[PDB]
Write a protein that binds this ligand. Sequence first.
Ligand code: 3T9
Length: 274
Amino acid sequence: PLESQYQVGPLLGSGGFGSVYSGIRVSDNLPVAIKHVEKDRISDWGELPNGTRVPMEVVLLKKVSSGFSGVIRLLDWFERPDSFVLILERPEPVQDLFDFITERGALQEELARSFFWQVLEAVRHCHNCGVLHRDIKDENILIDLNRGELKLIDFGSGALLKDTVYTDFDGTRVYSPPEWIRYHRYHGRSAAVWSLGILLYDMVCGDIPFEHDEEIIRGQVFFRQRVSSECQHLIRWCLALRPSDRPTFEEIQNHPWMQDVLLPQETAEIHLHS
Ligand SMILES: COc1cc(-c2ccc3c(-c4ccccc4)[nH]nc3n2)ccc1O
């Protein structure tokens, strides 16, 4: 039982990530996070080996929880009469990237580079395990302050990665690409590159570039902060209106702006205990 091996605590973020509470694995006092989702509110279901009917979030989580510390890992899960319970890693201390940027404003390019590199690595990992996140944004990224490591969270809007067209989407609209707004269809990788474009802009500029469908459709990027030419090119590239014109992950990590990133621990020593 859950009440048996974990000591449940208060809600986290007052409903920021939905119904997730802080907890402790009582056997070793491991900090965990405990997410509840009720069956009635589940739109997308999956099948686990051995045929157990389970929310897609769990299949995706099982596939990406391999020990790579770029994504928050699923330690365990339980089924209850009317809901499901997830036990997840809880970094300590930790801060959400959205709150980090809010408090700090536009990040210095050295720091945005380290962060953005880590996020790419995490997304590459997901794709390699057959998972498309679909909700990449600052709110879904945690910072492990001690180690300077970023971690992806919230795979609730995710899908199995496929090479064919997607026609559904339940993520954040201002992070969605022109194809979705205009046609309600997209391909996984080029849409993910678009959202990464939005994310990077948010990091260097302190906010998102588009607030309405029309701004997204137009694809004009105005920079309100001082941003290097190299970084501007990368952002404008990811935010190409035509999916085909967008870079591949390899092209992004080979971009000149991306060269000579800091190691996560270096990043923490320089920027996190500033
Ligand atoms: C990796 O997959 C998922 C992860 C989460 C999620 C959310 C908040 C989390 C915190 C935390 C700890 C302290 C403060 C704030 C957050 N720690 N670990 C978390 N995990 C929720 C759904 C998912 O599918």
